[PDB]
Amino acid sequence: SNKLDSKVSGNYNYLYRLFRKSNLKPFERDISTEIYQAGNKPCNGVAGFNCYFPLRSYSFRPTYGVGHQPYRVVVLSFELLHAPATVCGPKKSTNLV
Amino acid sequence: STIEEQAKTFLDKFNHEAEDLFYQSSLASWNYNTNITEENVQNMNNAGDKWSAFLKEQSTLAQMYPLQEIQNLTVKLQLQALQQNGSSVLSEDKSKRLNTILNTMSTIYSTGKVCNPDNPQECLLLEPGLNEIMANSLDYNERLWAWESWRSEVGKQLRPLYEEYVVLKNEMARANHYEDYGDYWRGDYEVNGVDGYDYSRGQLIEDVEHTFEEIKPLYEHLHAYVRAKLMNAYPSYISPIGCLPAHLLGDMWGRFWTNLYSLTVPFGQKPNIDVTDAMVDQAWDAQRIFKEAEKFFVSVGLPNMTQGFWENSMLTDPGNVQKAVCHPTAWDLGKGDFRILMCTKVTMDDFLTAHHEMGHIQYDMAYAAQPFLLRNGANEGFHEAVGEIMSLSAATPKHLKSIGLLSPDFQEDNETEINFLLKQALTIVGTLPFTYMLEKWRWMVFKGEIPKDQWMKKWWEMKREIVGVVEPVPHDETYCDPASLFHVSNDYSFIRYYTRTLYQFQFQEALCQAAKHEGPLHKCDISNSTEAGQKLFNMLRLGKSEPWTLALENVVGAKNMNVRPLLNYFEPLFTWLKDQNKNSFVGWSTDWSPY
Numbered sequence: 018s019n020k021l022d023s024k025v026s027g028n029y030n031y032l033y034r035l036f037r038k039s040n041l042k043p044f045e046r047d048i049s050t051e052i053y054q055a056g057n058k059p060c061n062g063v064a065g066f067n068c069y070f071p072l073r074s075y076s077f078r079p080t081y082g083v084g085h086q087p088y089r090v091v092v093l094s095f096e097l098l099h100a101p102a103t104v105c106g107p108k109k110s111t112n113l114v
Numbered sequence: 115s116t117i118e119e120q121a122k123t124f125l126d127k128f129n130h131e132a133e134d135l136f137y138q139s140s141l142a143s144w145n146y147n148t149n150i151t152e153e154n155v156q157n158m159n160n161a162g163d164k165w166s167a168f169l170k171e172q173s174t175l176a177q178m179y180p181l182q183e184i185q186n187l188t189v190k191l192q193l194q195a196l197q198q199n200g201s202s203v204l205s206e207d208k209s210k211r212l213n214t215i216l217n218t219m220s221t222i223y224s225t226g227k228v229c230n231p232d233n234p235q236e237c238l239l240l241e242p243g244l245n246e247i248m249a250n251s252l253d254y255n256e257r258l259w260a261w262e263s264w265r266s267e268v269g270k271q272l273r274p275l276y277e278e279y280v281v282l283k284n285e286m287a288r289a290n291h292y293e294d295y296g297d298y299w300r301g302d303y304e305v306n307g308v309d310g311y312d313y314s315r316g317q318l319i320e321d322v323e324h325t326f327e328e329i330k331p332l333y334e335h336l337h338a339y340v341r342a343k344l345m346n347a348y349p350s351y352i353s354p355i356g357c358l359p360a361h362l363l364g365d366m367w368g369r370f371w372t373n374l375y376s377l378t379v380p381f382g383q384k385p386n387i388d389v390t391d392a393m394v395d396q397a398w399d400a401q402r403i404f405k406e407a408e409k410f411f412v413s414v415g416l417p418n419m420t421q422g423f424w425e426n427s428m429l430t431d432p433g434n435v436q437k438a439v440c441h442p443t444a445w446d447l448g449k450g451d452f453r454i455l456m457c458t459k460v461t462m463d464d465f466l467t468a469h470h471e472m473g474h475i476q477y478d479m480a481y482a483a484q485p486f487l488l489r490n491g492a493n494e495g496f497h498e499a500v501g502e503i504m505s506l507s508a509a510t511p512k513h514l515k516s517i518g519l520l521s522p523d524f525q526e527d528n529e530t531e532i533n534f535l536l537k538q539a540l541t542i543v544g545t546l547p548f549t550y551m552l553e554k555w556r557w558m559v560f561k562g563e564i565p566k567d568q569w570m571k572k573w574w575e576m577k578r579e580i581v582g583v584v585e586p587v588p589h590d591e592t593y594c595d596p597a598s599l600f601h602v603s604n605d606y607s608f609i610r611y612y613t614r615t616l617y618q619f620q621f622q623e624a625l626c627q628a629a630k631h632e633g634p635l636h637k638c639d640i641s642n643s644t645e646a647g648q649k650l651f652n653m654l655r656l657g658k659s660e661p662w663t664l665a666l667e668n669v670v671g672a673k674n675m676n677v678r679p680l681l682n683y684f685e686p687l688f689t690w691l692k693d694q695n696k697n698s699f700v701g702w703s704t705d706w707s708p709y
C-alpha cells in the first residue's frame with residue numbers, strides 16, 4: 018500500500034503500540050493511551066524518565082525498502098456456531114436441459 | 115522490575131525513535147549533498163541540531179543506569195556507547211571553545227590557499243592546483259617551494275590553534291576517566307568483560323609495534339628501490355646513504371606513493387592490466403558497471419541489492435544546473451534504505467571505487483537485524499577493510515577475463531605483475547610507516563611525554579628512523595607542520611588506516627583458503643565461491659554486536675594483530691626487491707646529507 022499509505026513528507030496517521038504491560042489475548046483490542054510504566058517510580062501522568070507513551074506513529078514514506086513499505090492487511094475470521102450459517106459462497110447455474 | 119529491564123525498555127524506546135530521526139537527518143544530508151541549496155543546508159542544520167539534541171538528552175537519561183550490573187554483552191555495549199559525554203563533560207565555555215577551535219581550523223584548512231608571491235591578482239587553492247603541482251611536476255624547486263610555503267603559512271596560523279587543541283582534547287578525555295585523548299581513540303579497540311577476547315586500551319601501541327617491526331624490513335628494500343629509482347630523476351639532490359627529501363614523495367605528506375608509479379616503473383614497456391578501453395568500446399555505462407558488481411557480489415554469495423537502491427541512488431553527475439558532491443560516499447539512511455552517491459565515470463578506478471563502496475553498503479545490510487546503535491562495525495577498521503577486498507578481487511585479471519573486459523588470450527607474465535605489485539606496495543606499504551609514525555607522535559603528545567617545545571624535532575627525528583624521509587630544512591615551533599594534514603585538522607583518527615591494511619590482508623588469506631585456491635595471493639579471485647561468502651558473512655552479520663577480536667577469530671582464527679598475510683602477497687615483490695637492491699644501500703641513515 019505504498020501508493021496509498023505513504024507521503025513524501027511522511028504519513029504519520031498510522032500508529033502502533035510499542036509497549037504494554039502484558040501480551041494481548043486472541044482477538045483482543047487494546048486502545049488504552051495510559052503512559053507505560055517502565056520503571057518503579059510512578060508515572061503520575063508524565064511521560065518522563067522510565068515513562069513513555071505506549072503508542073508510536075509509523076513514518077511511512079514511498080522511499081523506504083520492501084520490508085518497511087506500508088502493507089494493508091485484511092484479516093478474515095470464520096466461526097461456526099449453533100446459529101445457522103448465513104454466509105454462503107456463490108453457486109454455479111447450468112443452462113436448463 | 116530491576117534496573118536492567120528498565121534499560122532494556124529505555125533502549126527499546128531509543129532504538130525506534132532514533133532510526134526515524136537518524137533517517138530524517140540522513141535524508142536531509144543526502145538531499146543537501148546531492149542538491150547544494152540554501153534550503154537544503156538549513157534542513158540538514160535543523161535535522162542535525164535535533165539529532166545532536168536527541169543524542170544529548172538520551173545520554174543524560176542513560177547515565178542513571180549503572181554499568182556494573184548489566185549482565186549480557188549486548189545491552190552493556192549500547193549503554194556504554196550512548197552514555198558517552200563527548201565534549202559535554204566540561205563546562206559550556208570550555209566545550210564551545212573546543213567546538214569553535216574544531217570549527218575554525220576546519221575552515222582554515224578548507225579555505226587555506228597558498229599562492230605564488232608578486233602576483234596577488236589570483237591565487238591557487240589547495241585542492242585543484244596544489245594537488246597537481248606535486249603529483250605530476252618534475253621540478254625540484256617548484257615542489258620545494260610548494261612544500262615550504264604551504265606549511266609556513268598554515269603552520270603559523272595553526273600553531274596557536276594546535277596548542278589549545280591538544281590541551282582541550284586532553285581535558286575532555288581526562289574528565290572522562292581516560293589517561294589522555296590518545297587513550298580515547300584507543301578505546302575503540304578496547305574489549306572488556308569477555309574472557310579470552312579481552313583487549314586493553316593501551317595494548318594497541320605495543321601490538322601495533324609488534325606488527326610494525328616486520329613492516330620495516332619489507333619497507334627498507336622498498337625505500338632502497340625508490341631511492342635508486344629517484345637517482346635517475348634526481349642524481350645529486352638525494353644522497354644514496356641519506357633519506358628522501360620530503361617534497362619528492364609525490365604527495366603533500368607522503369601518505370600515498372602512487373604518484374611515483376610512472377617515475378619508479380620497473381618495466382615501462384610492459385603494458386598494465388587496465389582494460390578501460392573495453393568499457394567505452396562496448397558501451398558499459400555506470401548503470402551496467404554496478405550491475406557487473408552486483409553480478410560479482412551474488413557470485414561470491416552476498417544477496418543482490420534491493421530495488422529501492424535503483425530509484426534512490428544517482429550514479430551519474432546531475433549536470434551544471436544541480437550541484438552534487440562528487441566525493442565517493444556510501445549512504446546508510448536506515449529503515450531498510452541504502453544509497454550510494456556516485457559521480458561515476460567510465461574508468462577502471464570508478465569500477466574499483468564502486469566495488470569498494472558497495473562493500474560498505476553490502477556490509478550495512480548484514481547488520482540490519484542488529485539495533486540501530488549497534489548497526490556498525492565491530493571496530494573502525496572493519497568497515498573499510500571489507501570493501502577493500504572487493505576491489506582487490508575485482509582488480510584481478512581473472513575477474514576481468516571472466517566478465518569479458520580482458521581478452522582471454524592476454525599473457526599474465528611475471529613482468530606485468532611486479533609493476534602491479536609495486537603500485538599496490540606504493541599505496542599500501544608506503545603509508546604504513548607514515549600512518550604509525552604520525553599517530554605514535556599523536557598519542558605521545560597527547561600523553562604529554564613530548565615537551566611542548568619539542569614536537570617537530572622529535573617528529574623530524576622519527577621521520578629519519580621510521581619512514582626514512584629527510585626534511586627540506588629544520589622547522590622551529592613558530593610553524594605547526596603536523597596540523598597541515600586534512601585528518602588531524604578535523605579531529606580524525608589516523609591509525610584506522612593502518613588497521614584496515616592488516617585487516618584487508620588478513621581477511622583475504624582466510625577468504626582465499628576458504629575458496630580452495632592453489633595459487634599465490636595476487637591471483638586469488640574469490641568469485642564463484644558461495645561457501646567463502648557465507649563464512650565472510652559470519653563476521654558481517656555480527657557487526658558491532660560482537661567484539662572485533664571475536665569477529666576476527668571467526669574468519670581468520672586469530673583475535674590479535676597479524677602481519678603474516680602482508681608478507682605473503684608481496685613475497686614475489688619482496689624477493690624481487692632483493693634482486694635489484696644488491697647495488698643500492700638497503701635501509702637509510704639519519705644524517706641530513708641529501709638536503
Ligand SMILES: *[C@@H]1O[C@H](CO)[C@@H](O)[C@H](O)[C@H]1NC(C)=O
Pocket residue numbers: 149151153436
Ligand atoms: C534541487 O534544488 C532546486 C532548488 O531548490 C530544485 O529546484 C530542484 O528541483 C532540486 N532537484 C531535485 C532533484 O530535487
Ligand SMILES: *[C@@H]1O[C@H](CO)[C@@H](O)[C@H](O)[C@H]1NC(C)=O
Pocket residue numbers: 122185186187188189
Ligand atoms: C541478554 O539480554 C539482551 C537484552 O535485550 C538480549 O538481547 C540478549 O539476547 C540476552 N542474551 C542472552 C544470552 O540471553
Ligand SMILES: *[C@@H]1O[C@H](CO)[C@@H](O)[C@H](O)[C@H]1NC(C)=O
Pocket residue numbers: 177197198199202203289290291
Ligand atoms: C559524563 O558527565 C557526567 C557529569 O558531567 C558524569 O557524571 C559522568 O560520569 C560522565 N560519564 C562518564 C562515562 O564518565
Ligand SMILES: *[C@@H]1O[C@H](CO)[C@@H](O)[C@H](O)[C@H]1NC(C)=O
Pocket residue numbers: 418419420421
Ligand atoms: C534478487 O534475487 C532474487 C532471487 O534470485 C529475486 O527474486 C529478486 O527479484 C532479485 N532482485 C533484484 C532487484 O534483482
Ligand SMILES: *[C@@H]1O[C@H](CO)[C@@H](O)[C@H](O)[C@H]1NC(C)=O
Pocket residue numbers: 528529532
Ligand atoms: C619471469 O620468469 C622468467 C622465467 O623464470 C625469468 O627468466 C624472468 O627473469 C622473470 N621476470 C621477472 C620480471 O621476474
Ligand SMILES: *[C@@H]1O[C@H](CO)[C@@H](O)[C@H](O)[C@H]1NC(C)=O
Pocket residue numbers: 413516517641642
Ligand atoms: C562465475 O559465474 C558467472 C555467472 O554464472 C560466469 O559468467 C563466470 O564465468 C563464472 N566464473 C568462472 C571463473 O567461470
